[PDB]
Amino acid sequence: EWEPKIIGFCCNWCTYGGADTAGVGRMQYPPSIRIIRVMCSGRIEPSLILKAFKEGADGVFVGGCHLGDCHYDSGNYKWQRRVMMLYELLEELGIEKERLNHEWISASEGEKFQNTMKDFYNKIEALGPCKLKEELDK
Amino acid sequence: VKIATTWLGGCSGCHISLLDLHEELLNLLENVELVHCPVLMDVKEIPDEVEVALIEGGIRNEENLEIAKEMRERAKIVIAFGTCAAFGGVPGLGNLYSNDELLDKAYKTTITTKNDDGIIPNEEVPELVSRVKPLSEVIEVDYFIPGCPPNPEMIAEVVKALLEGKEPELPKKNLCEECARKKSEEGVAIETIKRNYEGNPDPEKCLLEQGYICLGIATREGCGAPCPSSGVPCSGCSGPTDAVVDQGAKMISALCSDFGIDNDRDVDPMILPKSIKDKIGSFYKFTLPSAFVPIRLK
Amino acid sequence: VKLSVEPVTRVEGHGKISVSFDDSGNLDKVRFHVVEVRGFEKFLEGRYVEDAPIYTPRICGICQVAHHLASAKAVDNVFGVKIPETAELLRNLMHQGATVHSHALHFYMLAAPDLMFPTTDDVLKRNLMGIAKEHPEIIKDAIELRKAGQNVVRVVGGRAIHPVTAVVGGQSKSLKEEERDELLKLSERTIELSEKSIEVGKKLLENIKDEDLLDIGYFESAHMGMVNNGVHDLYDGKLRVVNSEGKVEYEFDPSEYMNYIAEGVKPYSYLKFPYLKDKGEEDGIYRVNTLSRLNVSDKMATPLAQKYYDEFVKEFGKPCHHPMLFHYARLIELLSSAEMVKELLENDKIVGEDIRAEPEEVVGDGVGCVEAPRGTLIHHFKTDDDGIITDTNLVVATVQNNPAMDIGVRKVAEKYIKAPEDATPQVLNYMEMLIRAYDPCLSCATH
Ligand code: NFU
Ligand code: SF4
Ligand code: SF4
Ligand code: SF4
Ligand code: FES
Ligand SMILES: [Fe+3]
């Protein structure tokens, strides 16, 4: 009766290509996520993650190049520093750290992207809906 | 020009800053017909045909909600007066707890409190709304004056502009503009993070580059930067600029980006979360009710 | 029948008065309700303890200095640091300037409209604008007093509202000799205006006595105020309690406040009802604020205030229990604070650069006490080893006059109201005049 609402941010170069690779390979995974394209994972910031939770996101995914393989050299290192703060900020807000998932996925890694989507879906499905959207609506 | 003020979940500071017009308060009141103001006059009901309304404080209880709606109906122009009305302010930290936790502390478990039947005040008093809300979240707000409290001149410019019929316009840059402290032209790099009691801050060097979480970079100008001038980091009380919605999120983004930037690929990304014990209190002092996530879930 | 005075006006914060009548029409129950609360005591848990002087000023925009200093003192005990003397003088300097601003604000802009027009129908006239139109020089003196006090705060605290200089171990910045020089130059005018304020106070309280209003809300109680060898002090010393006959019951350090003070809860007000826990709810009623501080003190600390205070004691004795004479005590403190500003600006240690000591090991417990303009103010913080607040308790000034205000408004109703027809606009405003005499700050009292 209820399906997780998951939001994804994937870099254009590596992770967005990994999601394409999974589609070319007919690698099925749950239809919860919607992916938003950015050029680089360094484009991702806390406000975008928090904005998604505000809108109703039960889980948030971010995918970028492997560390060192950034198409723009070092965008992912900035993103990695931000997401570690964001994990613990989400806890101070009573949002399970597990509701946020960041992975490093290259364009060739369609299989890894498939199981990442499956592992994250099951994790969020077991957590149940995130109750933020329904508290603000009181 | 009939104007009215009122206050909600604030501390009266915005009204006091209005009185800190000093001599100019009289010149202001000569040109304006003040028809309602609880702190200064005895008009009990908000009259009809109010042209301008200054509403201080955010929404903290059911009575605040009804007054905000009544003033919106009665007033032509509603102004969010101060940071509490605009962003939620310091009382917004109450959103980190349930009302039950807020009330049980004040009226049961405080050390000096004595309440044998364990009652929570409930007669002739309003209940709290579920969370502190900015004024714009419950009514339509036409203008706002940021600041905790807004400086007196800024209050003067906004109102006189509206008396003249011109739109008020706030300053738009972040705080480093007004601040007299010196930056590195090579850019901000942060080696370690210090709590404001640690070390001896150099009077002329930017406090953020010294390692102190300073909110000047994520805070609108206008105040004159008295806190960094006086030897302490900016706490962000004026709120974000027009191009930032979540002041705390942007400060975190900036802080994380430049932490260990000189050693970008090797600095451990877990040093920064572990060195900050109170994160919401570091970055959301005055604006938590207006953040994307304005509460702690329980 | 039921009548409501809401909002109570020309006070800080949200309060209302209820008057109910039974089936016979006879006066039945009269209550003072405070209808606001924000919960600072709970949401301070989890914050950095050194940020407490940043949050607690936002309890109130009038007395933000008092909270800033009370939290700083508590923080100074949480860390095991003793601030250097120059820091002590700067904080007290800022404290006196704030008291000048607060007392002037209340007597002139909140209280005086009733003292000038106690029996008027013209409600749009009972405000500073009404005073300014018929006696403009009085409101301009009020403004110049506030401007002088706030100016002291801005210079020493960095901001006139919500100061930030009081940090762990002392002050974040020092006072410069040029700033010291112009503040000292300006201090003389503040003292003169305070003397003139006392004289107008005499005139307007005479007008009040002429109308048989000087004894409204009268009852007898204990009185609490901080003294320094029995000398009136707003910044440092021990808390002294005097019983209704003037006998000193106890003298205790503020760190022991919990062994002497208890706060009760009633269902009809967010404002609690303190009392001397030793004496109990009814016999332990005490008051704080201007007049209570005079009753407990042996003498004032400044010469000009001593003279008016001696003259006042000769006329009304010790202790004085009249609510409306809190106004006159407020004007004496107004002068004494003005004098103390000058005295502190003349103390050559005011411009010292040794303004802060390095914070020591974290004790984890700290109590900070100061006499706010509206009574004894206590900040009690407890932290963990990282200095993160785990528990806070705030006994904030006006809360301790809430029993006095609740008793007072019903004794005003007993004197003037027998039937609903007696609750005229002027009589209902009498009830608010009893409230206003105590200078209540209801955002502060509830926090
Ligand atoms: N004076 C004062 Fe407050 Ni606004 C009260 N009541 C203080 O701590
Ligand atoms: S803004 Fe700063 S000042 Fe104006 S009210 Fe909310 S808190 Fe008191
Ligand atoms: S201090 Fe706070 S404000 Fe002055 S510069 Fe460094 S940051 Fe921008
Ligand atoms: S500085 Fe940061 S804090 Fe001090 S005022 Fe300007 S804004 Fe409010
Ligand atoms: S472009 Fe993919 S992480 Fe930078
Ligand atoms: Fe309390």
Any CB–CB contact under 8 A between C278 and chain B?
no
In chain B the first and final C-alpha atoms are separated, in Å, by 47
Looking at chain B, list the stretches that DSSP marks H as alpha helix, in order from N- to C-terminal side.
13-19, 23-31, 62-74, 83-87, 99-104, 152-164, 207-210, 226-229, 247-258, 271-275, 279-283
Q: What's the rounded Cα separation, in Å, for the pair C373 and C388? A: 29
Contact B241, A43 (CB under 8 A): no
Centroid of ligand 1 to alpha carbon of C287 (angstroms): 14
Residue A93 is nearest to which of B250, B270, B297, comparing CB atoms?
B297
HSE at residue B286, side-chain half, CA atoms within 13 A, is: 26
Question: Residue A94, by phi and psi: left (phi above 0), alpha (psi -120 to 50) or beta?
Answer: left
Contact A82, B256 (CB under 8 A): yes
DSSP bridge pairs for C389: C383
The DSSP code sequence of C184-248 is: HHHHHHHHHHHHHHHHHHHHHHHHHHHTT-TTTT----EEEEEEETTEE-SSSSEEEEE-TTS-E
A22 backbone dihedrals φ, ψ, rounded to 5° = -65, -35
Give yes or no for residue B234 CB within 6 A of ligand 4: yes
Contact A109, A16 (CB under 8 A): no
Give yes or no for residue B238 CB within 6 A of ligand 4: yes
Residue A138 is nearest to which of B130, B257, B294, comparing CB atoms?
B130
Give yes or no for residue A87 CB within 6 A of ligand 5: no
In chain C the first and final C-alpha atoms are separated, in Å, by 33
A103 backbone dihedrals φ, ψ, rounded to 5° = -140, 155
Contact C353, C42 (CB under 8 A): no
Tokens found for residue B217 = 């970079």
Q: Among the atoms of ligand 4, which is closest to the Cα of residue B215?
A: 2
Centroid of ligand 4 to alpha carbon of B284 (angstroms): 14
Contact C170, C83 (CB under 8 A): yes
**β-pairing verdict for C15-21 and C2-5:** antiparallel
Contact A64, A81 (CB under 8 A): no
Residue B43, classed as helix, strand or coil, is coil
User: Which letter does DSSP use for residue C275 in this model?
Assistant: E
Residue C265 is nearest to which of B39, B115, B197, comparing CB atoms?
B115
**What determination technique applies here?**
X-ray
Q: What's the rounded Cα separation, in Å, for the pair C318 and B146? A: 48
Q: What angle do CA C373, C264, C296 make, to 5 degrees?
A: 40
Residue nearest to atom 6 of ligand 3 (CA): B206
User: Which letter does DSSP use for residue C361 in this model?
Assistant: S
Tokens found for residue C52 = 């407490």
Find, among A7, A13, A33, A18, the residue nearest to A75 by Cα.
A13
Contact C39, C30 (CB under 8 A): no
Tokens found for residue C193 = 């205006």
What CATH number corresponds to the domain at position B88? 3.40.50.700
Q: Looking up tokens 């301009």, which residue turns up? A: C140
Q: What's the rounded Cα separation, in Å, for the pair A61 and A55? A: 15
Q: Which domain holds residue B82?
A: 2-164
The secondary structure of chain A, three-state, reads: CCCCCEEEEEECCCHHHHHHHHHHCCCCCCCCEEEEEECCHHHCCHHHHHHHHHHCCCEEEEEECCCCCECCECHHHHHHHHHHHHHHHHHHCCCCHHHEEEEECCCCCHHHHHHHHHHHHHHHHHHCCCCHHHHHCC
Q: What's the rounded Cα separation, in Å, for the pair C390 and C161? A: 28
Which residues does chain C break after (C to N > 2.5 Å)? none
With the most atoms of ligand 5 within 8 angstroms of its CB, the residue from A37, A62, A72, A81 to mutate is A72
**CB atoms near residue C26 (< 10 Å):** 11
**β-pairing verdict for C170-171 and C166-167:** antiparallel
Cross-chain residue pair B232–C172, CB shorter than 8 Å:
yes
CB interface of C with B, residues 201-260, below 8 Å: 257-258
Contact C191, C340 (CB under 8 A): no
Q: What's the rounded Cα separation, in Å, for the pair C78 and C69? A: 14
Contact B154, B47 (CB under 8 A): no
Q: Among the atoms of ligand 5, which is closest to the Cα of residue A64?
A: 3
Residue C383, classed as helix, strand or coil, is strand
Find, among C432, C381, C397, the residue nearest to C59 by Cα.
C397
Compute, in degrees rounded to 10, the torsion defined by CA atoms B185, B187, B188, B189: -110
DSSP bridge pairs for A36: A9
In chain A the first and final C-alpha atoms are separated, in Å, by 23
Tokens found for residue B29 = 């009141």
Find, among B59, B60, B53, B39, the residue nearest to B81 by Cα.
B53
Resolution (A): 2.2
Tokens found for residue A40 = 């680089």
DSSP bridge pairs for C380: C367, C393
**β-pairing verdict for B2-7 and B50-56:** parallel
Q: What's the rounded Cα separation, in Å, for the pair C198 and C309? A: 11
Cross-chain residue pair B265–A136, CB shorter than 8 Å:
no
DSSP bridge pairs for C252: C239
C224 backbone dihedrals φ, ψ, rounded to 5° = -125, 140
Cross-chain residue pair C146–B19, CB shorter than 8 Å:
yes
Contact C191, C304 (CB under 8 A): yes
Cross-chain residue pair C123–B107, CB shorter than 8 Å:
no
Helix (H) or strand (E) holding B34: strand B33-36
Residue C4, classed as helix, strand or coil, is strand
Find, among C201, C232, C223, C238, the residue nearest to C336 by Cα.
C232
Cross-chain residue pair C270–B125, CB shorter than 8 Å:
yes
